[PDB]
Design goal:
binds malate like intermediate, binds sodium ion, six-stranded mixed beta sheet, 568 residues, flavocytochrome c3, oxidoreductase, monomer, FAD/NAD(P)-binding domain, binds flavin-adenine dinucleotide, 3 domains, Flavocytochrome C3, Chain A, domain 1, Flavocytochrome C3, Chain A, domain 2, 18 helices, 17% strand, binds protoporphyrin IX containing FE, alpha/beta
C-alpha cells in the first residue's frame, strides 16, 4: 500500500473519510479531519499511543487544533511538519522527506487561465475585511475588526496557525504597566521609546515607534483583558529595565499568546481558513481595494470581495536567498523561523502598489542552539546566564544589542560560544526546562567537569564564573559593562548550551503609517489596504529589541483591524 487512503480502502469505504457527495469540505479539511478523530481519537489521545520519553509526534507546543492532515495526506505520501526544524527519529507511515518548495507569487503568474476564470466568476464570499496570515498580528486584527462590527475572513497558507508568533519565548515589551508596577519595576513609554530608538540606531520611524511605546501597556492590557498571563517581566538585550512580559514563572509567551487569540477568534465564530494563501490584492477602477484572490490548496483559486485587506504575513527570515541578496554576510546561516516565513506576503503587498523600506536590515538572533538548530531565548541571558568562549572566558556584555552580540559570538573560536548558567537561573525561567528537555543543555556538578564535557578550558571557566560572581556581588561589571547583573551563578549544578547566530527577523517590509495603512513609493495611502506586524518596515529600524516584535504585532494588528473596520 503506497499511500494511506489506499492502505485504508483495503477494508473501508470511501465515505468513512468523505462527505456524501465526496467533495472536500473546505481547504481546512474540517469534515475529513473530524473523520480521522472519530476513529483514532483526538490529537492528545493519539499521542498517548505514540510516546517516546523525549519526543512525541502528536504532542507539542503548537497552539490551536492541529489537523491530522497537517502531516498525513490521504492519497499521496507526505511530510512530518516537525522535520522543518527538528530531526526526531520518525516512522511516519507514508512519509516522504521534508522539503518545502512553494511557488513564489511571481511563479503563480503561470496560472492565468485558472486565475482569469476565478476572477470572472462571482466572489466566493462577500465580507467587510480579509486578514491574511494567522500569526499574532493576524488574529489581533481579525478580533479588533470583528469587535469594531466588521465581518472577517482570516486566511493562513500553512496547515497550522500561529506563524512565527507561536514560537515566541522571552516576551512582550510593554511599559509602564501595572505588571512592572507590581514587580517593582519603574519604566515610562518614553524610556521604552528611547530604548527602542537607540536600539534601532535612530533609523526607526519615530511615529511608528511612538505608537509602539504609547500603546504597549494598552496592548498588554488588551491581551490580559482577553485571557493572557503577562505578569513575569524579564530583561532582554538593549532595554534599560525589565519589561519583557511572559507568563508567570518565565514560560514561552508565544504559544500562549497565540492560544489566547485563537480561543478569542473561536469565541466570536471568526471564519478561519487554513491551506489558503493570499495571492493578489484586487482593486477597483479608482484604485481602492475591492477584494483578494486566494489559492485554496484543496479547492483551488477563488476570490473574496471585501472593502479592506489586512496583510499580516510576517517576515522573510526563512528565505536565505532573499536574505543573502540583501545581506551577503547572512548567506548560509540557519534560520529560527517557521517554514513558510519567506516573504510572499511582501510580494503581495508590492504587487498592490505598497512600497518597501528598511529591507537590508535583517536581524540574526545571537543564540541559536548549535546542537538543536533551534533558537535559545535571550531571556536565558536576561535572567542571568553569561556567555563564554572556548577559552572559558567571557567576551561580551550578554544583554547588549543583537547586532553586537552576534558579531561578538561569530568572532569567537570556532564561531560559536556557550551560554553558562546554574539552577538559580534555570529555576527563574521555566522555558530552560524545555532546552534541558531537548537535550541541548549539558550539565555537571562543577565547572571543571562541564568544561571537560563540552570542550571549554575547565579551570579558566571556573575562574571566569567566580570573577563574574564577585562582579554580581559588587554590582558593577567592570569587564564588559553589562548593566544588569541579576544573579550570582552559584546555586546547584551548572549547564552549558552551545550557541551561534541564526537568521531571525526582517526589520524592513511594507511602508505603513500610524493607522497601519499601506502607502506607495510617493507616500500615498492605498485605500482599503493595511499592514501589521513583521511584514512592515519602519518600526524596529536597523536593530530590533528582544521583546518588541510581539508588542509590535499586537498593537499594529489591533489598530489595523479597527482602522480597516471603520474604513469599512
Ligand atoms: C523562534 C522565534 C521566537 C521569537 N521570540 C520572540 C519573543 O519572545 N518576543 C518577540 O518580540 N519576538 C519574538 N520573535 C519574533 C516574533 O515572534 C515575530 O516577529 C512575529 O511572529 C511576527 O508576527 P506576525 O503576525 O507579524 O507574523 P507571523 O507570526 O510570522 O505570522 C504570519 C502568518 O502569515 C502566514 N502567511 C504568509 N504569507 C501568507 C500568504 N500569502 N497567505 C496567507 N498566509 C500567509 C504565515 O504562514 C504565518 O503563519 C520570535 C521569532 C521566532 C522565529
Ligand atoms: C485522513 C484520515 C485518517 C488518517 C490520517 C488516519 C491515520 C491513520 C494512519 C497513519 C494509520 C496507519 C497506516 C499504516 O499503519 O500503514 C491508520 C490506520 C488505521 N486507521 Fe486510519 N486515519 C484516518 C481515518 C480513519 C478512519 C475514517 C478510520 C475508520 C473508519 C480509521 C481507522 C483505522 C484503522 C482501524 C487502522 C488500523 C489499526 C487500528 O487502529 O486498529 N482511520 N490510520
Ligand atoms: C477509493 C476511495 C476514495 C476515493 C474515490 C476518494 C476521492 C478523493 C478525491 C477525488 C480527492 C481529491 C479531491 C479534490 O481535489 O477536489 C480526495 C482527497 C482526499 N481524500 Fe479521498 N477518496 C477515497 C478514500 C479516502 C480515504 C480512504 C481517505 C482517508 C483515510 C480519504 C481522505 C481524503 C483526504 C483527507 C483528502 C484531501 C487530500 C489528501 O490528503 O490526499 N479519502 N479523495
Ligand atoms: C488526531 C490527529 C492525528 C491522527 C489521528 C494521526 C494518526 C496516526 C496514527 C494512527 C499513527 C500510527 C501510530 C501508532 O499506530 O501507534 C500515526 C503516526 C505518526 N503521525 Fe499521526 N496522526 C495525527 C496527527 C499528526 C500530526 C499533526 C503529525 C505531525 C506533526 C503527525 C505525524 C505522525 C508521525 C511522524 C507518525 C509516526 C510516529 C513515530 O515514529 O513516532 N500525526 N499518526
Ligand atoms: C509536532 C511538531 C513538533 C514537535 C512534537 C516538536 C517537539 C519539540 C520537543 C520535543 C522539544 C524539546 C522541548 C519540549 O519538551 O517541548 C521542542 C523544542 C523546540 N522546538 Fe519543536 N517540535 C515540533 C515542531 C517544531 C517546529 C516546526 C519548530 C520551528 C518552527 C520548532 C521549534 C522548537 C524550538 C524553538 C524549541 C525550543 C524550546 C521552546 O522554544 O519552547 N519545533 N520541540
Ligand atoms: O529570545 C527570544 O525569546 C526572542 O527571540 C525574542 C525576540 O524579540 O526576537
Ligand atoms: Na519587518
Amino acid at each position: 500500500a503506497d499511500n494511506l487512503a489506499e492502505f485504508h480502502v483495503q477494508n473501508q469505504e470511501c465515505d468513512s473519510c468523505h462527505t456524501p457527495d465526496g467533495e472536500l469540505s473546505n481547504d481546512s479539511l474540517t469534515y475529513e479531519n473530524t473523520q480521522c478523530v472519530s476513529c483514532h481519537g483526538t490529537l492528545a489521545e493519539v499521542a498517548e499511543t505514540t510516546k517516546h520519553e523525549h519526543y512525541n509526534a502528536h504532542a507539542s507546543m503548537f497552539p490551536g487544533e492541529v489537523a491530522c492532515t497537517s502531516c498525513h495526506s490521504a492519497h499521496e505520501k507526505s511530510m512530518v511538519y516537525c522535520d522543518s526544524c527538528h530531526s526526531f527519529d520518525f516512522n511516519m507511515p507514508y512519509a516522504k522527506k521534508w522539503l518545502r518548495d512553494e511557488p513564489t507569487i511571481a511563479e503563480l503568474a503561470k496560472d492565468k487561465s485558472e486565475r482569469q476564470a476565478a476572477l470572472a466568476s462571482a466572489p466566493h464570499d462577500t465580507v467587510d475585511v480579509v486578514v491574511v496570515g494567522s500569526g499574532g498580528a493576524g488574529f489581533s486584527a481579525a478580533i479588533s475588526a470583528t469587535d469594531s462590527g466588521a465581518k472577517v475572513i482570516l486566511i493562513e497558507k500553512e496547515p497550522v496557525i500561529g506563524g512565527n508568533a507561536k514560537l515566541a519565548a522571552g516576551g512582550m515589551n510593554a511599559a509602564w504597566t501595572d505588571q512592572q508596577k507590581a514587580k517593582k519595576i519603574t519604566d515610562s513609554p518614553e524610556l521604552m521609546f528611547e530604548d527602542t530608538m537607540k536600539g534601532g540606531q535612530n533609523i526607526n520611524d519615530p511615529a511608528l515607534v511612538k505608537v509602539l511605546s504609547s500603546h504597549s501597556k494598552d496592548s498588554v492590557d488588551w491581551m490580559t483583558a482577553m485571557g493572557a498571563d503577562l505578569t513575569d517581566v524579564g530583561m532582554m538585550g538593549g532595554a534599560s529595565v525589565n519589561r519583557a512580559h511572559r507568563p508567570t514563572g518565565g514560560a514561552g509567551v508565544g504559544a500562549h499568546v497565540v492560544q489566547v487569540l485563537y480561543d478569542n477568534a473561536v469565541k466570536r465564530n471568526i471564519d478561519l481558513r487554513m491551506n489558503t494563501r493570499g495571492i493578489e490584492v484586487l482593486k477597483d477602477d479608482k484604485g481602492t481595494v475591492k477584494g483578494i484572490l486566494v489559492k485554496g490548496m484543496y479547492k483551488g483559486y477563488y476570490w473574496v470581495k471585501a472593502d479592506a485587506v489586512i496583510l499580516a504575513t510576517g517576515g522573510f527570515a526563512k528565505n536565505n536567498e532573499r536574505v543573502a541578496k540583501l545581506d551577503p554576510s547572512l548567506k548560509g546561516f540557519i534560520s529560527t523561523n517557521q517554514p513558510g516565513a519567506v516573504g510572499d506576503g511582501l510580494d503581495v503587498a508590492e504587487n498592490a502598489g505598497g512600497a518597501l523600506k528598511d529591507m537590508q536590515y535583517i536581524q540574526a538572533h545571537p543564540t541559536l542552539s548549535v546542537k538543536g538548530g533551534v533558537m535559545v531565548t535571550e531571556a536565558v541571558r536576561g535572567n542571568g546566564a553569561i556567555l563564554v568562549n572556548r577559552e572559558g572566558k567571557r567576551f561580551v556584555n550578554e544583554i547588549t544589542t543583537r547586532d553586537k552580540a552576534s558579531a561578538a559570538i561569530l568572532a569567537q573560536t570556532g564561531k560559536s560560544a556557550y551560554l553558562i548558567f546554574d539552577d538559580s537561573v534555570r529555576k527563574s525561567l521555566s522555558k530552560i526546562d524545555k532546552y534541558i528537555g531537548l537535550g541541548v543543555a549539558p550539565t555537571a556538578d562543577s565547572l571543571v567537569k562541564l568544561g571537560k564535557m563540552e570542550g571549554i578550558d575547565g579551570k579558566a571557566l571556573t575562574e571566569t564564573v567566580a570573577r563574574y560572581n564577585s562582579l554580581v556581588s559588587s554590582g558593577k561589571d567592570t569587564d564588559f559593562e553589562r548593566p544588569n547583573l541579576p544573579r550570582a551563578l552559584n546555586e546547584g549544578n551548572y549547564y552549558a548550551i552551545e550557541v551561534t547566530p541564526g537568521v531571525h527577523h526582517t526589520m524592513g517590509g511594507v511602508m505603513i503609517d500610524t493607522k497601519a495603512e499601506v502607502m506607495n513609493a510617493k507616500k500615498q495611502v492605498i485605500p482599503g489596504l493595511y499592514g501589521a506586524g513583521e511584514v512592515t518596515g519602519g518600526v524596529h529600524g536597523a536593530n530590533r529589541l528582544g521583546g518588541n516584535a510581539i508588542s509590535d504585532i499586537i498593537t499594529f494588528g489591533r489598530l489595523a483591524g479597527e482602522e480597516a473596520a471603520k474604513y469599512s
